[PDB]
Write a protein that binds this ligand. Structure first.
Ligand SMILES: O=C(CCCOc1cccc(Br)c1)N[C@H]1CCSC1=O
Ligand SMILES: O=C(CCCOc1cccc(Br)c1)N[C@H]1CCSC1=O
Lengths: 161, 162
């Protein structure tokens, strides 16, 4: 994990994080971080390879207020798996279907809460033949991910702003 | 594998569960402490564990919160800090280490806690060992489990404290 700490710039750091995630077996990621006093977007540091059409769709639809992982991050330090049970409201149901259309189906989000009051998330999505396979995989690497998210948080917070 | 923590209904039951989890991982002494957002009110911090009472009192009276290198570390980082000679840098910190050792707190680590609602704290665990090579073997073997444990302890502890 030391390679993240030793990155000098955002481009280098992002490429290292993306490669680490890929080597682990996740094809898509989002790392997002806000400074302490900031609420919604605006000065958010966002990296990764989420589909650009999804990012724009999400913003226009005001999905920060719909996405169940966002509310979860505001109240918890524990991972939230993208299971059907988290998409409860009608808007969350459509959110799930639209995310799926954009290729985001199986995954998890690790909330990020930095020492300086940074608020964010490391989300990782996996391609799998089915949900059971995706969950077996995520469980198999969970302790590694749990360390990764804190290393990414500490190093990213130092570069983000 | 940490479900007992969240399900715990009271501070005494929760404390005992956490102490047993730490013991099972090889650590006979722990401190779990949490303060609310932007607070330095240690008098009203949520503190559990089994550090020697003589050490706690000494620490408080000497104002060691301002000397202990693990406290300043927690303020700036989410990463663990191992209790190694290299962390005791100032003259006062060398004295701190000597006294901490007189109280049996030579080997261990501190995991900083930063809660979703701004809580600040630490899960500290001390291990008994003959030397640091042995202590390191003991700690390295359970580090990934501790890393998850500290966050489960934070989430559940923050609910009970605040
Ligand atoms: O990755 C996410 C967002 C996770 C949370 O992101 C956050 C949360 C708080 C602050 C910031 Br910046 C980003 N959602 C996923 C769920 C399935 S589809 C999708 O976009
Ligand atoms: O366990 C600790 C203290 C860890 C940090 O504790 C904290 C930090 C922030 C808020 C609160 Br409450 C407690 N120190 C150890 C180092 C060796 S001897 C000793 O007491």
């Amino acid at each position: 994990f030391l390679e993240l700490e030793r990155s000098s710039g955002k481009l280098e750091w992002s490429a290292i994080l993306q490669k680490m995630a890929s080597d682990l077996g996740f094809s898509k990621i989002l790392f997002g971080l806000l400074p302490k006093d900031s609420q919604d977007y605006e000065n958010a540091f966002i990296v990764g390879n989420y589909p650009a059409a999804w990012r724009e769709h999400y913003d226009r639809a005001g999905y920060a207020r719909v996405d169940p992982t966002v509310s979860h991050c505001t109240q918890s330090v524990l991972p939230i798996f993208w299971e059907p049970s988290i998409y409860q409201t009608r808007k969350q149901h459509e959110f799930f279907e639209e995310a799926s259309a954009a290729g985001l189906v199986y995954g998890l989000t690790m909330p990020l809460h930095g020492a300086r009051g940074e608020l964010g998330a490391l989300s990782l999505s996996v391609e799998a033949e089915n949900r059971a396979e995706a969950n077996r995989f995520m469980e198999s690497v969970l302790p590694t991910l749990w360390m990764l998210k804190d290393y990414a948080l500490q190093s990213g917070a130092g570069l983000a702003f």
